[PDB]
């Protein structure tokens, strides 16, 4: 009667967070608590904490906090966990486990599991080294890596653009190569794919005065390409 149904398997890029499922069943849902247990490959279990569906009140063990984050709903019987900032350590098999008071606080009945696997020199050149341009023209920037961004599994190119302004912090513009970051003009428009990517200014303003880095984005490895300089003339 009793039943723990845990969400499917999760196979994930590092740095990401997922978030899985247990719906319980054949027991009122508020009057167990909900517990979490990790379990590396080949290793031990190991405790991460609870859930009381009742007050939604929650116990971690110290080790996971600000990694699992515990949550339930009592309207579909239902307890969550999330992971952030997945690395390579978070890779195990997660059970979602009834506690019971009347068995000694032990765990009653658990779930199936769900499996959370977290798996996946180089030379940035960049182009015109600089160039100066009459305001409103058009500028068009170069950048090529030695070797393929583009990532065929999420199909998404991990390039990035920064602007930076004299004696200023660098600014991130574009991200996955044609994604515009919030509070950056529509004029700035990045694009290309595999190993040639280009950053374009629809019509270039006085403020455009900056020096712009391409980066090949990739946790693990970062790489700046050398920069294009940008001075704006009269007209």
């Known amino acids: 009667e009793v039943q723990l149904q845990q969400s499917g398997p999760e196979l994930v890029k590092p740095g990401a967070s997922v978030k899985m499922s247990c719906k319980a069943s054949g027991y009122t849902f508020t009057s167990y608590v909900m517990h979490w247990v990790k379990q590396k490959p080949g290793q031990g279990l190991e405790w991460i904490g609870y859930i009381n569906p009742y007050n939604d009140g929650t116990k971690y063990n110290e080790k996971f906090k600000g990694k699992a984050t515990l949550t339930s709903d009592k309207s579909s019987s239902t307890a969550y966990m999330e992971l952030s900032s997945l690395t390579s350590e978070d890779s195990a098999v997660y059970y979602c486990?009834?506690?019971?008071?009347?068995?000694?606080?032990?765990?009653?009945?658990w779930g199936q599991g769900t499996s959370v696997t977290v798996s996946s020199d180089l030379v940035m050149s960049q182009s015109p080294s600089s160039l100066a341009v009459s305001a409103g023209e058009k500028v068009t920037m170069s950048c090529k890596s030695s070797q393929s961004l583009f990532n065929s599994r999420t199909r998404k190119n991990y390039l990035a653009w920064y602007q930076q302004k004299p004696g200023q912090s660098p600014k991130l513009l574009i991200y996955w190569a044609s994604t515009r970051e919030s509070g950056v003009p529509d004029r700035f428009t990045g694009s290309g794919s595999g190993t040639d990517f280009t950053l374009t200014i629809s019509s270039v303003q006085a403020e455009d005065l900056a020096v712009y880095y391409c980066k090949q984005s990739y946790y693990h490895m970062y790489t700046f390409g050398s920069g294009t300089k940008l001075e704006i003339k009269h007209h």
């Open positions: 486990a009834r506690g019971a008071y009347k068995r000694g606080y032990a765990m009653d009945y």
